[PDB]
Scaffold this motif. Structure first.
Motif, mmCIF file in Angstrom:
data_model
loop_
_atom_site.group_PDB
_atom_site.id
_atom_site.type_symbol
_atom_site.label_atom_id
_atom_site.label_comp_id
_atom_site.label_asym_id
_atom_site.label_seq_id
_atom_site.Cartn_x
_atom_site.Cartn_y
_atom_site.Cartn_z
ATOM 1 N N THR A 1 0.826 -1.200 0.000
ATOM 2 C CA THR A 1 0.000 0.000 0.000
ATOM 3 C C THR A 1 0.855 1.242 0.000
ATOM 4 O O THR A 1 0.339 2.351 -0.139
ATOM 5 C CB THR A 1 -0.951 0.055 1.206
ATOM 6 O OG1 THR A 1 -0.200 -0.058 2.428
ATOM 7 C CG2 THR A 1 -1.989 -1.029 1.121
ATOM 8 N N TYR B 1 -2.561 -0.257 -4.050
ATOM 9 C CA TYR B 1 -1.526 -1.226 -4.095
ATOM 10 C C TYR B 1 -0.531 -0.877 -5.179
ATOM 11 O O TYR B 1 -0.911 -0.440 -6.264
ATOM 12 C CB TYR B 1 -2.136 -2.601 -4.270
ATOM 13 C CG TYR B 1 -2.910 -3.009 -3.040
ATOM 14 C CD1 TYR B 1 -4.298 -3.031 -3.046
ATOM 15 C CD2 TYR B 1 -2.230 -3.326 -1.890
ATOM 16 C CE1 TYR B 1 -5.004 -3.368 -1.901
ATOM 17 C CE2 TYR B 1 -2.927 -3.666 -0.747
ATOM 18 C CZ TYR B 1 -4.306 -3.685 -0.739
ATOM 19 O OH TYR B 1 -4.962 -4.013 0.438
ATOM 20 N N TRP C 1 -4.712 12.733 -3.200
ATOM 21 C CA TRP C 1 -4.987 12.884 -1.793
ATOM 22 C C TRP C 1 -6.444 12.980 -1.384
ATOM 23 O O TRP C 1 -6.819 12.487 -0.320
ATOM 24 C CB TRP C 1 -4.256 14.091 -1.271
ATOM 25 C CG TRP C 1 -5.011 14.652 -0.151
ATOM 26 C CD1 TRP C 1 -5.428 13.994 0.943
ATOM 27 C CD2 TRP C 1 -5.481 16.007 -0.016
ATOM 28 N NE1 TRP C 1 -6.149 14.838 1.754
ATOM 29 C CE2 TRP C 1 -6.189 16.073 1.180
ATOM 30 C CE3 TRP C 1 -5.360 17.149 -0.804
ATOM 31 C CZ2 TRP C 1 -6.787 17.237 1.616
ATOM 32 C CZ3 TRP C 1 -5.959 18.322 -0.370
ATOM 33 C CH2 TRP C 1 -6.655 18.364 0.810
ATOM 34 N N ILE C 2 -7.275 13.573 -2.216
ATOM 35 C CA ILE C 2 -8.672 13.691 -1.859
ATOM 36 C C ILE C 2 -9.431 12.404 -2.166
ATOM 37 O O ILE C 2 -9.433 11.970 -3.312
ATOM 38 C CB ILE C 2 -9.273 14.868 -2.600
ATOM 39 C CG1 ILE C 2 -8.576 16.135 -2.145
ATOM 40 C CG2 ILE C 2 -10.756 14.955 -2.352
ATOM 41 C CD1 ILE C 2 -8.872 17.332 -3.004
ATOM 42 N N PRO C 3 -10.145 11.811 -1.192
ATOM 43 C CA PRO C 3 -10.914 10.572 -1.298
ATOM 44 C C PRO C 3 -11.928 10.629 -2.405
ATOM 45 O O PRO C 3 -12.196 9.632 -3.076
ATOM 46 C CB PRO C 3 -11.635 10.495 0.045
ATOM 47 C CG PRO C 3 -10.758 11.233 0.981
ATOM 48 C CD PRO C 3 -10.197 12.368 0.170
ATOM 49 N N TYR C 4 -12.451 11.818 -2.631
ATOM 50 C CA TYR C 4 -13.352 12.041 -3.720
ATOM 51 C C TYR C 4 -12.723 11.825 -5.065
ATOM 52 O O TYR C 4 -13.376 11.349 -5.992
ATOM 53 C CB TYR C 4 -13.901 13.434 -3.648
ATOM 54 C CG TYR C 4 -14.801 13.680 -4.783
ATOM 55 C CD1 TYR C 4 -15.648 12.681 -5.182
ATOM 56 C CD2 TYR C 4 -14.812 14.899 -5.409
ATOM 57 C CE1 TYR C 4 -16.514 12.928 -6.209
ATOM 58 C CE2 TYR C 4 -15.689 15.141 -6.442
ATOM 59 C CZ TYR C 4 -16.547 14.148 -6.824
ATOM 60 O OH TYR C 4 -17.511 14.344 -7.777
ATOM 61 N N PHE C 5 -11.463 12.213 -5.189
ATOM 62 C CA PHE C 5 -10.732 12.026 -6.417
ATOM 63 C C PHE C 5 -9.737 10.879 -6.328
ATOM 64 O O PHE C 5 -8.943 10.669 -7.246
ATOM 65 C CB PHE C 5 -10.019 13.304 -6.737
ATOM 66 C CG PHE C 5 -10.933 14.448 -6.948
ATOM 67 C CD1 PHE C 5 -11.027 15.434 -5.988
ATOM 68 C CD2 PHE C 5 -11.691 14.554 -8.096
ATOM 69 C CE1 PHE C 5 -11.850 16.521 -6.171
ATOM 70 C CE2 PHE C 5 -12.522 15.637 -8.285
ATOM 71 C CZ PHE C 5 -12.598 16.624 -7.322
ATOM 72 N N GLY C 6 -9.799 10.123 -5.239
ATOM 73 C CA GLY C 6 -8.896 9.017 -5.007
ATOM 74 C C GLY C 6 -9.101 7.857 -5.972
ATOM 75 O O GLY C 6 -10.153 7.721 -6.595
ATOM 76 N N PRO C 7 -8.079 7.029 -6.115
ATOM 77 C CA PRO C 7 -7.978 5.823 -6.913
ATOM 78 C C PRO C 7 -8.937 4.761 -6.415
ATOM 79 O O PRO C 7 -9.340 4.780 -5.249
ATOM 80 C CB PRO C 7 -6.535 5.364 -6.704
ATOM 81 C CG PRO C 7 -6.173 5.879 -5.354
ATOM 82 C CD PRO C 7 -6.925 7.173 -5.213
ATOM 83 N N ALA C 8 -9.311 3.844 -7.302
ATOM 84 C CA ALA C 8 -10.129 2.708 -6.911
ATOM 85 C C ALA C 8 -9.379 2.016 -5.800
ATOM 86 O O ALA C 8 -8.156 2.099 -5.757
ATOM 87 C CB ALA C 8 -10.381 1.774 -8.078
ATOM 88 N N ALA C 9 -10.088 1.385 -4.875
ATOM 89 C CA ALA C 9 -9.439 0.861 -3.678
ATOM 90 C C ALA C 9 -8.215 -0.009 -3.945
ATOM 91 O O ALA C 9 -7.203 0.124 -3.252
ATOM 92 C CB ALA C 9 -10.448 0.047 -2.894
ATOM 93 N N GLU C 10 -8.263 -0.854 -4.970
ATOM 94 C CA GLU C 10 -7.104 -1.676 -5.290
ATOM 95 C C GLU C 10 -5.932 -0.879 -5.858
ATOM 96 O O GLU C 10 -4.802 -1.365 -5.893
ATOM 97 C CB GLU C 10 -7.514 -2.757 -6.272
ATOM 98 C CG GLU C 10 -7.954 -2.215 -7.618
ATOM 99 C CD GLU C 10 -9.382 -1.760 -7.596
ATOM 100 O OE1 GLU C 10 -9.887 -1.497 -6.530
ATOM 101 O OE2 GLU C 10 -9.974 -1.677 -8.644
#
Ligand SMILES: CC(=O)N[C@@H]1[C@@H](O)[C@H](O)[C@@H](CO)O[C@H]1O
Ligand SMILES: CC(=O)N[C@@H]1[C@@H](O)[C@H](O)[C@@H](CO)O[C@H]1O
Ligand SMILES: CC(=O)N[C@@H]1[C@@H](O)[C@H](O)[C@@H](CO)O[C@H]1O
Lengths: 113, 107, 121, 235, 107, 118, 207, 235
Positions: free
Chosen positions: A18, A41, A29-38
């Motif tokens: 991670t 990795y 950095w912003i969760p709204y614009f964040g990467p798909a959860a995987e």
């Protein structure tokens, strides 16, 4: 200086983490614009330099007993911490002992003359 | 780099005679050791890994031994298919240094 | 040689609901790919298809009746069940629980239960 | 619980009576609890062997533990198995659980059987690795990722799209349990031994082509061994 | 769904008669077909398997044939015990279908 | 099972470079990160290098002066090495064979190819 | 994750190459992670602007973080919104989650619309502030409070009874949504811009 | 929060401004949070007194705390009590809760009454000790193990199988509440005061032996004072 696992050991640790150093954009950095959860990795492949991986597998093997016995002793359901406690005991064993120069502690510097 | 050697440079033996080969490494690498064999005109085949253990399909005659700087290979009751070149190898990271080599000879 | 057995609900008012069941007393039905199913013969009529059930958890229905028909099973007792919503006099029939007979090539199902029947009032 | 310290190019046990400062714990980010794939120990990947490695036991309640980043798994498993009466078997994974981040071939199983035990348990005590939490118990749904964990002191679409082999189970939790590979609504292949997911993958050469391909309302179950395929040997 | 028919819908019979019955499907069954025999108070016992083989425990008077959409059932040397309702079914596809049925009338 | 296919031995002009290649006979090579070794003049082996089979990253023996070009082509099931500035003294059996750190994995090259110069 | 040390009348970032003892961490109770109200940055309080600041995205599961308390908020929000088919939208708050203790004007929304996304997310990444747990997601019901967490090294009924303006939504998860204040079981006042909670409160002069 | 240092054969409170190194915290395993049995303070175990010790109040939500190994509790309690409309009273124990490891006499109660409040509350602020988690609130089901906790700085089937006494309650959460011992499907005995579990155990001298044993479709409830047994004094 410990012995390597007697299981055959696969030296090629294609691995994932991670960890992701830096942040090129604040959007990452912003969760709204964040990467798909995987997407958190990241990956690469370890090579068994200095023989460490096969020893690591043995470390894990021995650890399955040490750890699980501890886990039985735990009362937390998901046991999210441990290593932090280990850092605490590193410090507890390193500190509060008598320590001017003579004791085997405090990383004492050579004396000024 | 770790240095490695092997002896005797060759070892003549009668068929069904037990033989041993010995080898050394410049530093103790905690048994990251291996051995190989080949017929002339043939690629090496791993015989031994991790000092003391054998690759599957290697006959019971073979025995890895030792650790670190000193190790050996023994073949009980040597057979005609086993006469060939031998190698040792370093697995404690890379480069994977090899032993000087030995070869069996028929009596 | 399987003692396939029939059971079911009694007489019902039309516009009601009915549950039917069967069981394989002579066979565990544990072989993978066991197929069982139902068909009916109202008024001496030919083998109308009703449903198929597989030990592999596969279910099939006669789509004309499928809107009012559901498959259920209880393998621990070697049981098969059907439930029918809105049962009425058009559903009165001779019925059979069935199983593959050659058991594994070209269906051939083939093997029959004791036979049951349904009526309304 | 001892930790391996990496020093002088080798691992060393941390549980010693002197904390030599040749290694400095400058921060908590030198701490590690990395997971390792059980498979990297040469452990068998046969679907039946996986069953052989689980205890199938009712027991003291399950625990999971947080662990560090680590190697990809080639083989892992997902489970839909239920008791013969259709009862749920094995607890559903707990909230926030997801399958391990990088298994390349997650196997999946469905069907029913006695499915003995509550939490199963690994017979070696190996941890199931769900995402970042190691487990003492098998969870329904999410990927098992069998593995072990080591604690040490420090000084692209395929990354998730890879995944193969789904099969039915006949019975569960016992040596008599059997599994059958399924492709194209066909159930075939007991997976008896020595069959890699790729060994199975090449058998999709049979789908609508080289044998198989029923001309009937449904599947016939061929046995794994044309000799392998056991074409027309369904019964 | 798929149309199935059979003929003759009824056949007068006598002993030693060669019975001939047929089954027709709208769709190409490909030989995944079966035939059945039935009497009142009884299940419709299987007669033909895979468009040809008599089912085991079927008298050897019974034969069957065909491929594609056409199939038959025949009885060599008919015996009065062979009077029955007869049916066929399509196993090449589903929903399952069956023949319109036939009957025999000895006289 | 993996086998590392290669062309037969060949004569080369002095100062030649040769792009050695081997094609794995199966899928296991994808995680192998294969090793290269050499037997100049039938002499005991020298480790040559390795190539990561996912990234193509490489290492080589630092005594193997002038290294070799090292590349991988996972889509072709192949890996490559390139000989440089060849002379007759460089005649050697060149191995695509993989010397695993341990027996959990292994691969080898039986092709027997030797590059020679004149 | 930097922390600011309070010393010599200024904040100082913790990532320095010496841990100078001019300030002493005598105990763990000098540690702080206090929340700050987003509104204290001059950020708009318009009910639509709050919607404008929310991401309305499906995504990685939500997290909350324990943090030290904080400044009072003048404006905060509650949500009852459901998808047009009556489906729940946005997870209900988890046990132990409760609304921020000191918002003076908690606002509430109800009614339905597409309510896009599942974890919403703040567009600035600002934390929702639920009591002592900051959040990455909007929870149903309980007051959200917008803000950010600062980490620093240290060297009456009206307090919660204030709160105004509850309204219906026409549509959701978009800035096309209409917000209508409800008074005396009447639904009116689009709340589109420049209306303080008190501007809205005085509108009850019509009741 | 004070901790006691064991030194010079006595405990010493840790909330001082000087940390003398005569005692060294060489590891975290010198720390303790041990539970103590409230009963060890001479506190009454009468079931009515237990009710007298609880607040019966709705309130700020409950908390529990992890605590250390400690002395056996002779008397502890289990509760099935519900509000007069048959609604649940007092929260069910949280997942992983189980009764205290060594209670010798867990007293169980059943029946209904007003059961005031939602969180009860120990009046002393004493913590119920469920397994390894101390509590501010009574949980349904599992054993209460009332007790207190102290923190320290350090330098056979009957162990779990013992447990007696189950009874009905009439009313709840008030001191008008009545409790009746029940054995052999007979409800009897208000428990007066000062009755040890063993006193009550001695009342089983009447089960299939000395008197009692109702001769009717069901139990008759004797009123406790043969005088104690209150034979034929059920009304
Ligand atoms: C690709 C394909 O046809 N798969 C079928 C699926 O359509 C059907 O729903 C299922 C029923 O068990 O059987 C299989
Ligand atoms: C028998 C009984 O318990 N009754 C009393 C009741 O007379 C009194 O008013 C109330 C207030 O303490 O307490 C209770
Ligand atoms: C030992 C014995 O007879 N106990 C009975 C039990 O059988 C019955 O189920 C119950 C009904 O309340 O009453 C009591």
């Amino acid at each position: 200086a410990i012995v390597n696992a007697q299981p055959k050991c696969n030296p090629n640790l294609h691995y994932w983490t991670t960890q992701d150093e830096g942040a090129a954009i604040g959007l990452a950095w912003i969760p709204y614009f964040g990467p798909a959860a995987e997407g958190i990795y990241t990956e690469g492949l370890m090579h068994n330099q200095d023989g460490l991986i096969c020893g690591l597998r043995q470390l894990a093997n021995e650890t399955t007993q040490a750890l699980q016995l501890f886990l039985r002793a735990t009362t937390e359901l998901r046991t999210f911490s441990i290593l932090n406690r280990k850092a605490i005991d590193f410090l507890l064993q390193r500190w509060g002992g008598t320590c001017h120069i003579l004791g085997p502690d405090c990383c004492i510097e050579p004396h000024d003359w | 780099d770790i240095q490695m050697t092997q002896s005797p440079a060759s070892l003549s033996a009668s068929v069904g005679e037990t033989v041993t080969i010995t080898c050394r490494a410049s530093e103790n690498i905690y048994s990251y050791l291996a051995w190989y064999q080949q017929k002339q005109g043939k690629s090496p085949q791993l015989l031994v890994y991790n000092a003391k253990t054998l690759i599957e399909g290697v006959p019971s005659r073979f025995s890895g031994s030792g650790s670190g700087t000193q190790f050996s290979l023994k073949i009980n009751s040597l057979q005609p298919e086993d006469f060939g070149s031998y190698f040792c190898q370093h697995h404690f990271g890379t480069p994977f240094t090899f032993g000087s080599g030995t070869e069996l000879e028929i009596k | 040689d399987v003692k396939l057995l029939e059971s079911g609900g009694g007489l019902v008012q039309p516009g009601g609901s009915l549950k039917l069941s069967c069981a394989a007393s002579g066979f565990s039905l544990s072989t993978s790919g066991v197929g069982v199913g139902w068909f009916r013969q109202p008024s001496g009529k030919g083998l109308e298809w009703l449903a198929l059930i597989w030990w592999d958890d596969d279910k099939y229905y006669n789509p004309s009746l499928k809107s009012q028909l559901s498959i259920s099973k209880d393998f621990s007792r070697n049981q098969v069940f059907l439930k029918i919503s809105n049962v009425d006099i058009a559903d009165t029939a001779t019925y059979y629980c069935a199983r593959r007979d050659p058991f594994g090539y070209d269906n051939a199902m083939g093997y029959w239960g004791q036979g049951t029947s349904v009526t309304v009032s | 619980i001892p930790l391996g310290v990496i020093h002088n190019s080798t691992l060393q046990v941390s549980d010693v009576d002197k904390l030599v400062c040749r290694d400095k714990l400058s921060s908590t980010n030198q701490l590690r609890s990395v997971g390792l794939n059980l498979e990297g120990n040469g452990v068998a990947t046969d679907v039946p062997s996986a069953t052989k490695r689980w205890g199938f036991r009712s027991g003291v309640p399950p625990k999971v533990v947080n662990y560090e980043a680590g190697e990809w798994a080639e083989n892992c498993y997902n489970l839909e198995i239920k008791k013969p009466d259709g009862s749920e078997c094995l607890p559903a994974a707990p909230d926030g659980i997801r399958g391990f981040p990088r298994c390349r071939y997650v196997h999946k199983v469905s069907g029913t059987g006695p499915c003995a035990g509550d939490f199963a348990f690994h017979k070696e005590g190996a941890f199931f690795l769900y995402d970042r939490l190691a487990s003492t118990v098998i969870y329904r749904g999410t990927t098992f990722a069998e593995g072990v964990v080591a604690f040490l002191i420090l000084p692209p679409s395929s990354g998730y799209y890879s995944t193969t082999i789904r099969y039915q189970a006949t019975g569960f939790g016992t040596n008599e349990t059997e599994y059958l590979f399924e492709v194209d609504n066909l159930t075939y292949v007991q997976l008896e031994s020595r069959f890699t997911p790729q060994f199975l993958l090449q058998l999709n050469e049979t789908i609508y082509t080289s044998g198989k391909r029923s001309n009937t309302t449904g599947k016939l179950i061929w046995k794994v061994n044309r000799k392998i395929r056991s074409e027309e040997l369904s019964f | 769904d798929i149309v199935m028919t059979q003929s003759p819908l009824s056949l007068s019979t006598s002993v030693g008669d060669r019975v001939s019955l047929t089954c027709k499907a709208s769709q190409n069954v490909g030989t995944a077909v079966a035939w059945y025999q039935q009497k009142p108070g009884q299940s419709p016992k299987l007669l033909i398997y895979s468009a040809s083989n008599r089912y085991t425990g079927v008298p050897d008077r019974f034969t069957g044939s065909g491929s594609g959409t056409d199939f038959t059932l025949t009885i060599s040397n008919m015996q009065s015990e062979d009077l029955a309702d007869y049916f066929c079914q399509q196993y090449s596809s589903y929903p399952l279908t069956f023949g319109a049925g036939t009957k025999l009338e000895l006289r | 099972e993996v086998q590392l296919q290669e062309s037969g031995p060949e004569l080369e002009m002095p100062g030649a470079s040769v792009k050695i290649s081997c094609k794995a006979s199966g899928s296991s090579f994808t995680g192998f990160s294969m090793n290269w070794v050499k037997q100049s003049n039938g002499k005991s082996l020298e480790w040559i290098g390795n190539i990561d089979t996912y990234y193509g990253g490489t290492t080589y023996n630092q005594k193997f002066k002038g290294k070799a070009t090292l590349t991988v082509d996972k889509s072709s099931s192949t890996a490559y090495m390139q000989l440089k500035s060849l002379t007759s003294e460089d005649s050697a059996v060149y191995y695509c064979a993989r010397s695993a750190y341990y027996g959990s994995t292994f691969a080898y090259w039986g092709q027997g190819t030797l590059v020679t110069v004149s």
